[PDB]
Amino acid sequence: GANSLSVHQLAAQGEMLYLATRIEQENVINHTDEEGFTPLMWAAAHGQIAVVEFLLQNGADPQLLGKGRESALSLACSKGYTDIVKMLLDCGVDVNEYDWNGGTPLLYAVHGNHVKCVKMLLESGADPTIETDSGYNSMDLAVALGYRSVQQVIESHLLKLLQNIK
């Protein structure tokens, strides 16, 4: 049953009540598991919008990085969970954290063809020039993968960056 589940599994399953009890019976709201994942990260990775909101409101650290330098943001960006991404951005989280996978939230959003995530990240100052291990930046990924709608959004932003440099 629920008692045999980690606080992380409860978050990921969207078990609001059970989670709410576990984090009040002890200070496990920011407890990292073996991979360094927090309950917030598990909720983000599984699209549990209501749980993400509850956790954030109750003091879950949105900026904590996992052992691979994963964030709740990068996990939610890779899956295109636009509402969760917005909530994390509203917390003032860093958007340019480079992880041990050679990724950033923007690179993940582009890779997943998640155009709304891409727009949000760019507005929060995500850098479209940061590259993967293989030397692909956000524009390079969009072009190669054939994500023309993402490419269009990045292009409009690049024009603005260019206008600022001139």
Binding site: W42, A45, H46, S74, S78, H111, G112
Partner: peptide
């Protein structure tokens, strides 16, 4: 059918 470990995809 239980939620899988969070994992970022390869890029």
């Amino acid at each position: 059918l239980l939620p899988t470990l969070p994992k970022l995809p390869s890029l």
